[PDB]
Every structure is written in C-alpha cells, then in structure tokens.
Design an enzyme around this catalytic site. Structure first.
Site, PDB file in Angstrom:
ATOM      1  CG  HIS A 101      56.432   9.505  41.341  1.00 39.33           C
ATOM      2  ND1 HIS A 101      56.070   9.619  40.016  1.00 39.33           N
ATOM      3  CD2 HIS A 101      57.786   9.532  41.368  1.00 39.33           C
ATOM      4  CE1 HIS A 101      57.160   9.704  39.273  1.00 39.33           C
ATOM      5  NE2 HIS A 101      58.215   9.651  40.069  1.00 39.33           N
ATOM      6  CG  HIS A 148      65.422   6.083  38.203  1.00 37.67           C
ATOM      7  ND1 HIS A 148      66.442   7.001  38.341  1.00 37.67           N
ATOM      8  CD2 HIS A 148      64.271   6.801  38.206  1.00 37.67           C
ATOM      9  CE1 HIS A 148      65.931   8.217  38.427  1.00 37.67           C
ATOM     10  NE2 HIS A 148      64.615   8.124  38.348  1.00 37.67           N
TER      11      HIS A 148
HETATM   12 MG   LIG Z   1      61.516   8.343  40.359  1.00 37.56          MG
END
Ligand SMILES: [Mg+2]
Ligand SMILES: [Mg+2]
Ligand SMILES: [Mg+2]
Ligand SMILES: [Mg+2]
Ligand SMILES: [Mg+2]
Lengths: 392, 370, 387, 371, 133, 388
Positions: free
Chosen positions: B303, B203
């Site tokens: 995503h 992340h």
């Molecule tokens: Mg992610």
C-alpha cells in the site's frame, strides 16, 4: 430520592388501529413529585392482568428505591422467584418501569436520556413505515406499489411489507408457490415504483423453516431488499444463521427477544446483522444500550421495533439518537393521529426523519387525561397467529 | 559499528497533492558516516509531534546500537513501556527507523536490501494507480480516465465509488451507492476489456451484510479485488465476505505486525495483503508476513498513500517476493529523490543501487516544510 | 454547553514509588466554568510528549463540543487519520479526556457518574494489594508470606505477587525449573499464612508460551489461586484460551488491552473469565461499561487494573460501583501517602474495602496545587521490560 | 368431548414449609363431568394473580376444546400474543393445565398416563431427599442426617454447602465456600460409604471458572452430580464445566420447552436433565425432552420443590422413562391427596390408578388458604 | 392385559403393482380378545422368512407382555442378542408389531392412536402421488 | 469358476460354553469341487432362522458367481432390497459367506488368504483371554480374579480381560453405582498386583454407561495403566464416545457391534476409539476388515479382532491380523483347546501366549463337518443377552 407510586393505564387504540389493539402505560412518581412514564409491550396475557403485574412488581421491587439504581432494580426483578432467565412476560413489565426511571433520571438532571447514555449522535433519525391504505395493499403487488410511491412522496425513504402469507401457531412452515409468486411480485413492482429512492423491508413474521426461508430469499435477492425480517422462529438463532449465511439479503430480528443474553447469541451465531429490540420488551433503555454496543463488536446495526404505543417510540428514539450503529427507526405512519393526542407535544416527523426532542428524559409527556379517557374494551390480545396450519 | 544521530523532515506535498498532505521523513547516521533514509506513516497526530515521537524513539531504543540488529531494535521499541502489542502510532514510527536501517545495512554490504532478503525474483513490478482527473462520481468519465491509463501502459486501475466513509462505519450501502458502484464496473470493463484488471478500492465503509450486498452486484465484472470491505477490528467478520464472493478480498493498509496479518491469513479474511511499509512494522517484518502469506494461498500488494521512501521500501519487498501481485503507483515524487523511480509501461523497475536503491535529496525536502 | 480549555500535569511519584514513576493528568474546563479531571495511562513515549498528544487530540476533536457527546467525541478521535483500529497511544489519551467529560457530565447533573451509568450496586468495593517491602519480598516465599500476613491484619482479603521470574522483550519463554519452584513455594507459604482469610492473585506479566503457562499452572492449582494473570502475551487471545481451558485457575488479562473490539475477542474465545481494564487505557468510562456488560454475557467478571495515579483509580472505582459483575479492585497499599495528598478529599479505604464517594462526577478533585509542585525530573518510562 | 370449567386453589404450606410457602392448584372439568388436577409453578409474581392468569389462559385457549388435543392446546398458548418462545411465566401456567388434561385423558381410558406415553418400565422409582451449627453449615452434622436417611432406605442425598446465592450471580467461590464444600462431601462419604450417592446441589452461584475451581476439589468423592453450576442463560458456557470435570453436571430446573433442553443436550451442557413438570411445558413436552436425552447419553431426574401434584406428574414421566436416574422426594403431601403417594425403603411406588394416579382433596385445599 | 397370539400374512400386490410386489401383514391378539393389525416394511430377505422372523420376535419379546409397555417391548427387541444398534431388518419387524400394539392400545381406550399422542392437529392431510401411466 | 452349493450348520456349544451358546457355520462348494468354510456372527434372531437367511442370500447373490468377485458379491448383497446401509443382521450373513469365498480364493491360489491381502507381517500373534472360572466367584471377587489372571500369566498370556462394572441392561446407558466403581478399581488394583508388568489389563465393559458415567469410572482406573476401556457407552453415537476418549488417558476400544467401513470411518474420524475391535463374522467380511484396518493406519488406531463365537470367525480374525501392521492383540477363547480344536481338522496353534498362523491355504484350517453335524443346538436362547 425514592419511587413512591405507580399508576397504570390500559388504553384502547382507535380506528384505524395501526400499531395494534391496545397500549399499556405506566406512571412512576417519586416522593418529591417527579413523574416518569413508560410503556409495557407484552401480550402473553390480557392487558388488565399485565397492568396488575406491573403493579405487583413495582410494589415488590421498586417502591422505596432510587430510580437511578437501574442495575439493582433490574437484577432484583429478573432474579425474583429464582428464575434469572429471559422471560418476556416479566421482561416487558420490567421494560416499562425501567423506561420511566430514565424519564425521571433525565428530568432530574435536566437532560434528555440520550445525553446520559453516550450523547447525541444524530440530529435526525431515518424513518420507515409499513404500507397501509377483495384485493388491497396487503395482497396485491400493484396496490402496494402505489401505496409506496405515496410514502416516498411524503419523504419516507424506506417502506415495509409482509406479502409472504399467514403466520401460524405451527410455524415454521414451507412457502407455497403462491406465497413465492406474490412476494417477488411485491418486490418487483415496489422497486419499479420507488427506484433508488427507498429501501424495501421484507417484514416476515417467522413463517418459515430454514429451508423455506432460503427458497424465498433466492427469489428476492435481485431487488436488493434492505432486510429479511424474522425469516424463522425465535427459539434457535443457530438455525437462523444458516439462512443468513445463505443470502446476500441482511437478516433482521429481535422483536420477540429480550435481555442481553438472547441478543448475545444472535450476534455470536451470526443469526442477524440488524437487531430489532422493542424497548417495551427487551429490558429497558440501559439494556438496549448494552445490546447496541454488543452489535458494534459484530458488524451489526440497530433498528428498534415498534408496533405499540408512543412511549415505546420515545424510548426507541432515545436509544437511536445516541447510537453510532443506528440504521432506521420504525414509525406508525408519520406519528400523527392518536399517537400525537396521547402526547403533550407530538413526535416530530419531517421529510422521512424523526427529529429528537431536546426536553428532559424521554422528551415528551403522557397526556394522562387522554389516556384515561380511552379505556380498552375489547377482549382480544394485542396481536395473534393464524390457528390453522399453513396453506395447504 | 553503531547509530549516532537522527534528523526529521516534515515535508508539505504540493498540488495536486496525490498521496496525502505531508510526508514524514527520517535520516539515520552511523558512527563512521553511513546514512539511511526512511518514512513514517502516521496520521493519528500532527506530523510535528510525530517527528518528535521519532526522535524520542531513536534516543531510547536506536542510538548507540548496531543497525544490523533489527530484531533487537524492533523488540526494544515494540516492548517499550510494557506494551508489546500492535499499535499503529508506535509501529509507524518504527517502520521508518527500521527502513533506514535496511538502507544502512544494504549500503554497508554493497547490495540492495532485496538481495539480502531472498534475492531478486522480479525484473519488473506490475503497477497500478488510482483514477485521477467528474472522475470520482460519473461512471463514463472514469471509464475515460481508465482507457487513458491503459494507453500509458497500466495493467490495473483502482477507484472507490461506494460512497462516503464515516466515523461510525460500518454502514449499509444506499441503493444509489450500489447503483453507482455497479455502473462504474460495467462502464470501465467496457472501456478496457481484458487489458486491465479492476481494483474496487473501498475504505472499510460497510458492515459484513452491507458488503455481501455490494459484492453480489460486482462479481459479474471479474474485479481483481474488493479492498477493505468492512472495518479492521474483527478479521473473523471479514472472512464472511471473502467466503461469500468470488471476488478476492484485499486488506491491511490499517494493520501492523505479523500478529494482525497472521490472524487475517488464518481466519480466511483476505487473499491479498496490503502492507504499508511505513506502518506494517518495517521491511523485515513485512517479509515475514509475505512468507506467512505463502502458506495460505495469499498474495502481497503493498500500500502507498504517502511519500517516495515508503514506496522505495515497497519495491524492496516486491522484488524479492514470489507471491507479489501488483504495486501501487502515482512528479514531485521523483523530485525528493536523487535518482527518480523508473517506470516503463505499467511496470516499475527496481534499482540496483544498495539499500533502498535511492537517496532522499535533503535540499528539496527542507525547502518544502508543511 | 461546550468544552473550552485543557491543562496537562506531569506528576512525579515520590518514593517508595509504588504504582510507577510518573502520572499524567488532564483538566478539562467548559465555557461556563465546570471543571473535569482525568488521567492518561501511556508509556510508549515519555510523559512530556503524551501531554502534548493530549492537547493535539483535545484541539481537533474535543474543543467546542458538548462533553455529553461521548459517542461523538470518542468516534471522532478513534477514527482520526483514517485508522479506526485499537491503538494504546491514542486510546490512552482518549481515556483521560473521556473520564474528565464524565466528571463534567456528573457535576452538571449533581450526581456521581455511576448513578448515571446503571446506578450504585455495591456499598463497598473489595480491594487487593501487591505485597511490598517496608533476599526480599519479591524473591523469597517466607518474606512474602509475612507481608501477606500483615496485609490480612490490615483488612485485606486478597494479595497479588509475581514470583515467576523476569519478563523479557522476547517473551514468550519457558519457566526455569527454579521459576516453577519459587512460584510454587510462594503459593504454599502464603496460603499457609493467610489460610482462607485471603485469595492469592498470582500476577505474572506475559512471560510464558502457552505450553510454558500450562507447565506452571499445573503446579499452582492446589493452592486455589483466584487467578493466573496474563500467563502469555496479548496478541493472540485464541492462544490464551488454550491455557484457560487447561487449568482450574481462572485466567485474568486486560491491562494491555484497549477498546471493546479486543475484549470482545477475549470473551468469545474464552481467553479469560476476569477482565482487567485500566481506565486510563481501555478507552474511557462508557467504553469500560460496555465491556463489563459484554463480560456479563460470558460468565466473566471485571477487576479493574491500577498501576498509576489516583485519577485512573477514581474512574476504576466509578465503574466498579455500578457493575454487577465486579470481582475486586486493585489498590496501591491503602491509598495513603501521595495518593491521598493529590486529592482534595482522599479515597476512603476501610477494613479491606474502598467506599465510593457520593460527590458528583468522579467523586473527588485533583489538588492542582500539589500536582504542579511535583514534576517528573527523570528520564525513564512508567514501566519497562528486560533485554 | 370438551373442557367446561376451571377452578383454582392457592393453598398455604404449614410449618416446616418444606416445599415453598404456598401451592397453586387447578381443576379442569369436562362438560360431561370428568375432572383433572394440576399444579402451576410460579414464583415470579403472587398466588392470586397467578391464579387469575391460569383462568385467563383456560378461557382464551382451553375452554371448549378437546383435552386430548394437547399439541393444539400447547401451540395456541405458546403463540398467544405473537410470542412463540420459551417463557417460564406462561409455561408454568401451561404446565398445570396440560397435566390436568393428562389426568383427564387417563381417566377416560382407565389407564395411568404413563401407560399412554410408553408404558411402565419401572415398578419402583429411586428417590432422594435433602438433608434436614446445623445441617446446612456443619459438615459433621450433615453426615449424621445423611446416615439417618441411609438407615431409612434412601440411596442418595442432596446438600448445598456452596454458599449464598445472590441476585448478581455468577460469582466466585470463597475459600471458605471451597473448604466447607469439600468437607461436606468428605464427611458424608465417610458416613454412608457406597450406600448413597452425593448429589451436590448448587444454585447457579458460579461463573464457569469458579465452578471449575470447585469441581476440582469434589471429584475425589465421586458425587453423582454437580447441580446447576452456573446461571441458565448460556448452556454453551455450562458445557465448559461438563467437559472439565469427571462429575456429571445436572441442570434444567429453570428451563422450559423442548427448545432450551434441545440446546443443553447438543452443547453437552448437562447429562442429567432436571425438569420440573410444573414449569417445563407439561407431561408430553417432558416425554419429548426425555427421548431427546436418549440420543445424547443423558438421563432425567425430575426436580421437585413444590406441591404434591407436580410430584405426581414427575412420577408419571419417570415411571415410563428408560433414562430415569432418580426422583426428588420429601406429611401435608399426604393430606392433600385422596390417597397418599407410596414410599418404601428408598423408592417411590407408582400408582396404578388412572390419570395422575391420585386425586386432590378439594376439601383440604379450600381449608388452607394462603395468608 | 396380555398378548397371546400372532398371525402373519404375505400378500401379493396385483396389477398395476404400484407400491411394490408384496406386503407383509401381522395380526396381534390379546388373551381377552382384542385384535391389532400392523405391517412390516422389510425386503432385506424373502417375505415368507421375514414373516417367520416376526413370529420369532413375538415369541421371545412380545407374548405375555402388556401391549401398552411400548418402551419395554421396543427395548427388549432393540437389545435382544446384545445388539442395540440401528438395524433395518430388526426395526422393520419391530415397527409392524409396534403399530399393532398401538392399534390395540387405541381399540381398548376407544380412541384413535393420534388422540393419545398429542391429539388431532389436522382435519385433512395434504397428499402427493408419483406419476404413473 | 462358479459357486454351486451351500450347507449350513447350527452347532451347539458343549460345556463350559466359553464363547457363547451356539455357532453358525457355512460350507460353500464350487462346481469343480473346492470347498470354502466360514462363520456367521449374529443373534438378532434364533440360529435356525439365521441359517435359513444365509441360504436366502447365497441363492440370491452368490449362486453362479465367481467367488473372486467379492466387491460385486458384497455390493449385490449390501443393496438387496434397496437398503444399502449397515444392518448387522444382513452384514453378519454376508461376513460368513465372504469368509468362505476367501477360503476358496486362497485354496485356488495355493496360498493362505493373508498372502493375498498384503502378505505376512507377523510370525506370531499376541493373544488375550477372558478371565474364566472352572456367591463369590471370578466375576465379582477381585481376589479370585487375581488368581485367575495369575494362572493366565503362568501360561504365557500377556493380557487378561474382565468386566466388573455391573450388569448391562436393555435401558443403557446408565450411571455406575458406587459399588460398581469400588469393585472395578479393586479388580484393576488386585489384578495389577498379581501380574506386575508381565500382562496388560483389558477393561472389557459392555456399553453400560452414559458418557458422564464412563468418565466417573475412567477417572478411577487410569492409575493401573489399563490398555483399553472397551465400549464405555452404547454404539449408536460415536460423537459421544469420543468424549470419553478425550477425557481419559486409557485408550478406548470398540467395534464388536459395528459393521461396514462406513461405521468404522466415523469411529476413527470422531476419535471415538483408537483400538478397533471387529468381529470378522459380522464386520462385512475379510476384504472389508482389510479396508477398515487400512483406515485405522490413517488415524493412529490399531486393530484387535473380537471373538465371542466359533473357531471359524477365529480363523478369519487370524487371517486379518497376520497381514496387518497396525495389529495390537488377538482375543482367544482360552487356549483354543476343547471344542475349538475338535471342530477343526487341525487345531489352532497356540504356544506361550501367541497364536502361530497356519500356512495352509485359505483360512488355514478346515471344518470337521462330522463333528459339526454330531453337535446340533437343542436350546432356545440367543448367543448373548441383556438385563431388563
Ligand atoms: Mg486505500
Ligand atoms: Mg414485524
Ligand atoms: Mg499486572
Ligand atoms: Mg436445586
Ligand atoms: Mg467384548
């Protein structure tokens, strides 16, 4: 408000003389009585002379000025005699006086400096130490490893060592096979002693040429060193970037650099991802701040350099405390001994972390009396090279 | 033919809350009745204001216009107030409206949206999922959760073992971070063999040097990718990580417009692009990005950490893109839609119903406010 | 010390509407009382909503924090919703709050904010105005020249104008031959009328492609414009550098940029030598100081952008005052009219220069009373494009 | 052979003070009596302190060493204090000590230093001078002085009409700066025709773009160089100006050591290097810098704004350098030297005497202390 | 001071012949008598001929000149025939004569060449060899 | 088929000495009897020594080999002594011997060498000459040069070359004086007035300047649409020449001091020049020049063979140019009359500004060995020289 008076202090460092041979302190006094303290980090000249330089500059540039006016004071000094190019002799003197203005600025505002330059970010500052104590800690891997476990037991989470052989006036040179053996031996044993508990900091002193630095980096990678410090000399960051691109080890540098301009080149060329300004040299607190924001733009951190007195430590701490991209702070052992006697109240070290003062300015005051009572009597410079070529 | 009304569903996601806390849905209606659904992916503000933002945008740019005019609508919204630059706050709200337009465009033309954008290319979309229940901190327990997911048919699993991500990133990994990261890869590769790819799903934690350090200790387990190894502001920096390691770099969950992805492609920052169609700029903008990706030896892997409708659009892109690699996956999801999303042995099957292929059940959505 | 409450003001700009249709102010108040003021620059949504976003942001990251903790405040806000990428909506709101925190920080230090960020450098700040009216000043070179002549007579040493034709939602485009014609006549005529008494600031709004901008720059070099502003759109600085390398005219850009991350790329690519931050958008006063410091490392100067209220103006002034690489400051006329009425004490403009207040913080205070008495009744956004 | 003693001289320049306000000389003397002279360039501090700094460096690094050992000496100094990075303060002290060693080395061989660093190439050195409602602000008055210079034999003139340089450079040229600059170039060009080159001598006033604005208006007059267009920190940036204009960029008066000049050459920042030998690092370091310029289609033009001893060192380097372009020239310079620097019809004539070719008159230097 | 005479030597290398088959020596002399030695490293032709080339260069460029004027000498040679470009044949010959000029320069100043080009830095020189039987 | 014998001629060049002081020819003979001719372009050493060099090489690499084996022969010579890097001295000799092999190769096949290396492309080859005379003269008076070019045009020449930029020293590069600038522009201006659009101007500098020197001059010639700026700076760093080439609109032309594909590869790649000027008696040979011309096609460059020596190099240049699609112009020493005819068995064909390629085999013409032997070189200078 106007700066009125300067006193300088050249203070010899007693045994075991960790952090070098002497410190150079400055005391700035406003007309109304507010007192700032600062440290000059420079060794191009005998400490008696640098002190006189600080004095000459303060008369020429600072006397009669509002210490709030950092930009003006800095530019006046930097451009004096039509030079306006990074010169460590001047910039060290300048760094000293500039600190002490921030000390005054914060004292007047009743705030710590770091609450004037972006605000507190850390409640504690991660810390590291050189490994300190014919074979010994600086030459025998096993004794260094034992030295390190101790440090971890005191709660340090990072230790630094330079097992990489002498640094000479003819650098960069090429590592000997012994230099390579020892270095990796230090890494292997120290990592086995400390496991995940602490990062290894490979603290080289610009020994190598780019090729030699890659020869060594190749051998150290397996032990996950947190950085390779100054693998090559300061003059060409473009070349350092070749070492940095080669290895997974982060490259760290800056102790010999000054002004925002030089760190601009380091960042942009990708010569290092960890900056190590010494605040006694780099140009002062605001310049360090400016340089630390530049590093944010380049995926880079700050690890202020320290091999001098407690006042440089104070400025380092000020910067580190308000810096989102701060990685680690270099300490002289746990800031005990002469480092506490020179202060009115000591630097607070607890379980591997410096705890920032909440007092105005730099957060601590110079014990002037302790400072005057300890003159420098040696003749040498603070720090020096080996003046024979590198072995063989 | 013109757009008329908008309704906005703020919906609370029930336990186990996989995919966020809430979803933000939109419904577009035309003059003569046609209805489009969509989803906004925005979290820089409370979902209450976000819906009000969507209303605001619909009134100013979308109302009274032909939803066929994607280009016109898009550039109106994108240039509103003299900005014309990538902004995820706006782009998120836009990605939702544009999605709905493609629902209306397709339905009106009696075809799925993917048959309008280069036509079908895949009958099945290779899926992957996070490792869900410990499982986020113990190597062996993740290795278990992996081999279970293989038994269900999954060909790829993702996990973030690289430690906490702060508001001050990028940082340097700790020795323990490196140790657990590598341990996770070793053990899982051990549990799944050649049967399942490893998706190392970071992340943006690290600095470039920090990411190089970690990359070195994962290469040996042939991870399919290394997601967002550093923050997103400088793709130029990312490109150092990508060039140093044999592991592909994947990124883009935090990017928007062709402009930012363009720079990702040209600098060599990533070879796998991860558009969230609730953010990227819309489905038409997503397709252009995919095409750009064709020109740089790069692939797409949409995503998804939000609702079924973003996912629906993800599928529309994937079905008609030659350079599709894999699709993110996850219950209450199938509940919010009329017809559920078809899943069969690690593969989604795209609907052939017009538009987004499906419809939001509005009764279920209203019945669960946030 | 902790931040306690926030009030928002949406303020309508009465005619001649120079500097936009509405302003958005913020008022931050600490627990013990100190009052900070600030402005938000954002036209991605109507002002009434931008106001709401200001309270959402204040309540999650700001409330209860020490206003001295700017790095913390900013990074809590920047990092919200897992983003940590530039965004003008967010960074718009963040700028106003941050500004106001500096107001507080300064009032509590008994000091102007610039004396805390490097110190005074200039005793006076060079300013420039758009040519305004009183077949018109926006589209005829002669009337523009007359205007510029009156601006010089008032003390002005720089004027800005955009004669390069409408800016559209489909930019970039190519200049029409008439676009090039009028553009040159503007420079020729104004230059004839001001002589060496004032710099020409040729102030386009992102109209052209890189090829387009070069077609035009080739026609303007002879009149020595001080800059060519935002010649192309803002998404690829790599492309603006292509224009900046080609011409002798300095390229200036920035009004549509935010955070240090975007200006870093501008400086490094060579896209500009003059950075135009608006402090209502750029990410606040400390962020702007970081940006000006970077520009120093790159032969760049700062020239703060202003097309909004007096509060952005006040922060702009604070930045400029302590910035050694300050070129010139945008004014709205002489800061008379509403720009004066909205402040306890007005901005001091004197023979072509702004003189910074020595009062603490931003140096002035909003007139809350005036601000409440002037709400925005309309339906439009601050600025807009063509379709 | 070994070095024994040093002696410093701070000498004050009498009106019209062309060259500074004071000069800083040094005198190294070997155990067996051979005496070398040298000048230090330092404006960053004050004469008596700079002198003490000279003694400090002499004592720590030079006393008891063989003066032939330049590399050792230079590296001892450059790395003292764990520094080893360019620094004008140090390098300006090291420069004056190093010259004096050359003066010694030369004297111990009966040869001018230039015959030991490549040999004579030039029998005469092309010289330029500054022009001296005046000659710094009126372009008509400049052209007159320019015509005089041409009448005396000079074939190059330098002028800086570009505007006041501040402590906050780089800035942007005013429109008045632009018009005055072009007028200087135009009026002078009309006065000297093809008999003298225009050396345009800015002092780093400008930013890259500012410089380009100015260069545009100057190309027509074929100036021999645009001196120091911007500030010294980013040569990378300077090279942006070299690339744009047809006018050759010159720079180097504020730099020191091979490392910084290396970078100027490689970026293409300048094609005419202006070393001051009282600052750059010495005579050997300067020779290294001029060879380096040979690989880059670049020439040297030794800058001089100080005393006669730097001029001698400038002459030494120039005389043995195949890429020498022109030498800066300038009374009291005569009186300080045992024999005067020789000048005829626009050219400097290199002395054939050993070392630096001339000797300092110690008696006159001690008679003119700076106040 | 001026260069008067040159003399070449082609010398064959005896067993085990480590270092090539032959060496080419030059010997330069000044009108006043000072003697300088040098070697040419060139094998692009036969040695008897390369020795001739040496005497060619010396007759055109070197004789009459001051052996201190290294820059002039090197540039007359480097540029002769309108060439001025790295050529191994020429440069190998230039190198030999140039060496000898240094030998002479030194001999006349009574100093090692290295004392005129920066001074001693090393009191010893680390050495390596090829592996031989 | 095998090579057997070599003969060398050091031929001195009769007045007016256009094309330099002497020419160095080679005659190669195979066992069965075929003769091949070629020329060596080199002045690092005196010509007598060069000739002796040519026999050293032929004896060491060529004797006993089949002259069809160019690549073998070329690489044997290229690497003699463990060198294998450009070196005009060697490369010159090699060029001469290699030319002559192509004479033999063509004669054996019964074809002009050009019909072997890609075959005829041009029926005539555009030519140009230096402006020659017959102290105000043609090299320093723009007017007198304008008359010369006027005369040159009236013969059919479509291009004239000149060098007014001042002397070239052994310490180049340097800076053009204001007089060098003023004279250079005058030449261009005047000559252009006197020829209009009838003939191209060839600015034929000889490496005088530094990069910045080059640009100052370039800025003042651009307006006369010169066809080329020849060798604006020295040959060592093409990365620098490419700076001149980028700044100006005049095309940069160079290569008369370069050799082997390796050195032209760099020129093209850096953008150093867009017109390559090989002298085939130096570049490394005919096959080498072919490979080099083929590279230039990949980099938008053209060939324009250099000539300031004997007529045999000319034949080689013509052989190349005839089979080259990217051919631009060919240098001629006047109209190839005089000793350039007397030295040949049948002179070179020059009609109205164009050269017509022979269809006779090999190099197209034979050397008159008797005219070659009856003209020794008595002097003691080198072909071309510098200033000091
Ligand atoms: Mg992610
Ligand atoms: Mg260290
Ligand atoms: Mg604007
Ligand atoms: Mg100067
Ligand atoms: Mg030629």
């Amino acid at each position: 408000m106007r700066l009125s008076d300067i006193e300088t202090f050249v203070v010899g460092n007693p045994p075991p003389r960790h952090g070098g041979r002497y410190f150079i302190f400055v005391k700035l006094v406003t007309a109304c009585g507010i007192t700032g303290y600062g440290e000059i980090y420079n060794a191009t000249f005998g400490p008696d002379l640098v002190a006189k330089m600080a004095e000459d500059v303060f008369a020429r540039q600072f006397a009669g000025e509002d210490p709030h006016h950092i930009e003006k004071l800095w530019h006046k000094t930097y451009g004096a005699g039509y030079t306006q190019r990074p010169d460590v002799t001047v910039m060290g003197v300048l760094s000293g006086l500039e600190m002490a203005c921030w000390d005054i600025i914060g004292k007047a505002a009743g705030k710590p400096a770091y609450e004037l330059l972006g605000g507190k970010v850390h409640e504690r500052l991660r810390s590291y130490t050189y490994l300190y104590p014919k074979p010994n800690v600086y030459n025998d891997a096993d004794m260094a490893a034992e030295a390190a476990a101790k440090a971890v037991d005191q709660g340090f989470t990072a230790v630094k060592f330079d097992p990489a052989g002498a640094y000479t006036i003819y650098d960069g040179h090429q590592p000997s096979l012994e230099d390579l053996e020892r270095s990796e031996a230090f890494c292997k044993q120290i990592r086995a002693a400390v496991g995940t508990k602490a990062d290894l900091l490979f603290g080289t002193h610009g020994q190598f040429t780019v090729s030699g630095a890659k020869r060594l980096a190749r051998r150290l990678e397996a032990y996950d060193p947190l950085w390779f410090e100054e693998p090559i000399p300061p003059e060409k960051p473009e070349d350092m970037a070749e070492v940095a691109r080669y290895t997974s080890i982060p490259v760290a540098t800056g102790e010999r650099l000054c002004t925002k301009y030089e760190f601009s080149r380091v960042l942009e060329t990708g010569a290092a991802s960890i900056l190590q300004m010494n605040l006694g040299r780099v140009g002062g607190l605001l310049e360090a701040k400016k340089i630390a924001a530049m590093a944010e733009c380049h995926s880079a951190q700050i690890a202020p350099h320290l091999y001098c007195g407690p006042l440089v430590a104070l400025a380092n701490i000020q910067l580190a405390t308000c810096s989102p991209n701060f990685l680690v702070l270099e300490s002289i052992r746990t800031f005990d001994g002469f480092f506490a006697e020179l202060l009115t109240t000591p630097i607070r070290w607890e379980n591997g972390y410096i705890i920032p003062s909440q007092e105005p300015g730099l957060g601590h005051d110079l014990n002037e009396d302790v400072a005057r009572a300890n003159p420098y009597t040696g003749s040498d410079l603070h720090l020096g090279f080996q003046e024979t070529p590198a072995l063989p």
